[PDB]
């Protein structure tokens, strides 16, 4: 359907929300996975499904974390496909 | 047909709400059946239909109760089917 936050549809609009990001998970990577900073700690949120994630550990994959917690997201599905999603869920 | 709580579509996302489940009813069986912990007494709620259930007894089947109480649930319908739901209602 339609994204929960259309204003963050574009990559660059999400990137900029990270400012001088001071956390372990790469911001470019987080942004590509549909996330943008809430402006609270390391809390990021997906522009489309609206799902949020916090307490990111070093070397974690934004996409894997995205598919693991919010498999129902349509942005996830469009960019990754049922295969990738099923995979992450063994 | 849309779930009341889209953020609780994934099993993991629902399981983590029973992270501190004090009761006996198997938390995994509850999550697998669409329920997620609320916080009041042993009240659980279905991510899709919104139906709420509490006061779970010893050897109860989450799916059983789910079909018993909220038979109009589309999640229930997708995973179990008419036959299952009908048998439940003798």
């Amino acid at each position: 359907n339609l994204p929960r936050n259309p204003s963050m549809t574009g990559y660059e609009a999400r990137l900029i929300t990270f400012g001088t990001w001071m956390y372990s998970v790469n911001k470019e990577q987080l942004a590509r996975a549909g996330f943008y900073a809430i402006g609270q700690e390391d809390k990021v949120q997906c522009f489309h499904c609206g799902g949020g994630l916090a307490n990111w550990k070093p070397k974690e994959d934004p996409w894997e974390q995205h598919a693991k917690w919010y498999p129902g997201c349509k942005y996830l599905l469009e960019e990754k496909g049922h295969e990738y999603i099923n995979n992450i869920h063994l | 047909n849309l779930p009341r709580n889209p953020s609780m579509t994934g099993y993991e996302a629902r399981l983590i709400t029973f992270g501190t489940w004090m009761y006996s009813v198997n938390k995994e069986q509850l999550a697998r059946a669409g329920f997620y912990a609320i916080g009041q007494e042993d009240k659980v709620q279905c991510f899709h239909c919104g139906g709420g259930l509490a006061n779970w007894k010893p050897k109860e089947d989450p799916w059983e109760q789910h079909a018993k109480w909220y038979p109009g649930c589309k999640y229930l319908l997708e995973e179990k089917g008419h036959e299952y739901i009908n048998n439940i209602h003798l």
């Binding site: 998970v25 799902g51 994630l53 916090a54 307490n55 974690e60 917690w69 | 953020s7 983590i16």
Partner: peptide, 5 residues
Amino acid sequence: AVPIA
């Protein structure tokens, strides 16, 4: 990471 309300 874990979900947040």
